Design a protein around this ligand. Structure first.
Ligand SMILES: OC[C@H]1O[C@@H](O)[C@H](O)[C@@H](O)[C@@H]1O
Length: 453
């Protein structure tokens, strides 16, 4: 069973994680510039001031992509490089960088896939409440339409948002991501404003007859029951409560994007527990129904699963706990579970309308060391990729409309609050010299693309 003709074998990055040049050429301050410049937020006080210096070295990086034989390259645009203040003055030097990057990609036969928002909100917009302020929808819209209109001739695939779960909950509930806010109700407001922002862009692309594909990227976590792993009888309350908990991860974002409503079971529970105001629940349902429009593709970020069970006295917002099955784990503490990719894809196929699917991120963090001969023998990363590739092939064989696969990541980069301590690249980056070293996984992926295209 072969991968389809034209399958987009890719690699992915995000602007804040690789670009550096955080205050060059009139670039405004982002919430991640602010967050990493405050003590106690990032391991080892790492920041994205320099990162992989991709802003200056993009030409050499594109050459590595060509050598690799990528069909596509997924990256994000830094809003603050285009509108330093979020709205108003457009920065010509910002636009010129992405002009040069995109042209270089096109010259090398690589399909650009652009994430419009990958977490780096302008701090000036955060100053007025960021994603919690419904004015953000229009500011985002103007930014998105500017870049789409400028690049639509060279860029066919656009992703409105990457991982709304993180933007909302990690950014505004747990506060482990920028902007570091800790309020569940604010986080739900953010979810809603993201959905409206997304819908507005999809609508404008259709209504203005812009010939591009617009999607959104969600991290999805397939949830499994510890009780079933153990062979016990599953109680009704357990199944119900674990289902609720997994709706927070998955359905809360899939349902509005693909069906035009929020999951009602989740909302009923959140209102009952005074985690969501009854009025807001009704308004959110109505506004999403009014503005809903089906997208052109679904982007899925997949890394691992979760195993859960009922626990009446848990400190989580649902009475559930997590369990840790035996097996292999990455430096992130994430279970290596390729089967979860297959189960997830089949579950999307069976429970949602037909839609093309791209795996916009999948990869693994291992503690790479460079040998004396200047190599990186990341055989565990290779095994991780090989097994997930195989599950993707199996999903295709079972009728999933999978159209691409982007490895996270093209190169080692700043892993947000974990700093540079987590290496996901198929290319090693020595942060002292900015040298790029092709890992063994680079050559494995190169070969894999060659024999599956
Ligand atoms: O946490 C590892 C990776 O998770 C993904 O879901 C995010 O989109 C990436 O930006 C991040 O580097």
């Amino acid at each position: 069973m072969s991968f389809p003709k034209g399958f987009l074998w890719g690699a992915a990055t995000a602007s804040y994680q690789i670009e550096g040049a955080w205050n060059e050429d009139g670039k405004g301050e982002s919430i991640w510039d602010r967050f990493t410049h405050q003590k106690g937020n990032i391991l080892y006080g790492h920041n994205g001031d320099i990162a992989c210096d991709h802003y200056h070295r993009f030409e050499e990086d594109v050459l590595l992509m060509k050598e690799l034989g990528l069909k596509a390259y997924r990256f994000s645009i830094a809003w603050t490089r285009i509108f330093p203040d979020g709205f108003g003055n457009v920065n010509q030097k910002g636009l010129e960088f992405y002009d040069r990057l995109i042209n270089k990609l096109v010259e090398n036969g690589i399909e650009p896939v652009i994430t419009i928002y990958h977490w780096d909100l302008p701090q000036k917009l955060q100053d007025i409440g960021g994603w919690a302020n419904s004015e953000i929808v229009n500011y985002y819209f103007d930014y998105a339409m500017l870049v789409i209109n400028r690049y639509k001739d060279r860029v066919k695939y656009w992703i409105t948002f990457n991982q709304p779960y993180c933007i909302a909950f990690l950014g505004h509930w747990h506060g482990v991501h920028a902007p570091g806010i800790k309020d569940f109700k604010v986080a739900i407001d953010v979810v809603h404003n993201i959905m409206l922002s997304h819908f507005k862009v999809v609508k404008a692309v259709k209504e203005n007859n812009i010939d591009v594909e617009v999607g959104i990227t969600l991290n999805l976590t397939p949830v499994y029951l510890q009780t079933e792993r153990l062979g016990y009888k599953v109680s009704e309350i357990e199944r119900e409560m674990v289902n609720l908990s997994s709706q927070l991860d998955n359905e809360l974002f899939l349902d509005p994007v693909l069906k035009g409503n929020y999951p009602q079971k989740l909302f009923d529970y959140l209102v009952q527990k005074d985690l969501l105001e009854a009025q807001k629940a009704l308004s959110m349902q109505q506004e999403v129904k009014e503005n809903f429009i089906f997208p052109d593709f679904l982007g899925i970020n997949y890394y691992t699963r979760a195993v859960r069970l009922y626990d009446e006295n848990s400190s989580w917002i649902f009475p559930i706990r997590w369990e840790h099955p035996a097996g292999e784990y990455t430096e992130m503490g994430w279970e290596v579970f390729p089967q979860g990719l297959f189960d997830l894809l089949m579950w999307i196929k069976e429970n949602y309308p037909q839609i093309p699917i791209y795996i916009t991120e999948n990869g693994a963090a291992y503690n790479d060391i460079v040998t004396e001969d200047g190599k990186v023998h990341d055989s565990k990363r290779i095994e991780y990729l090989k097994q997930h590739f195989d599950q993707a092939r199996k999903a295709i064989e079972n009728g999933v409309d999978l159209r691409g696969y982007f490895v996270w990541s093209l190169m080692d980069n700043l892993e947000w609050a974990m700093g540079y301590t987590k290496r996901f690249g198929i290319i090693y980056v020595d942060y002292e010299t900015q040298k790029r070293i092709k890992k063994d996984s680079f050559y494995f992926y190169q070969q894999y693309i060659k024999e599956n295209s």
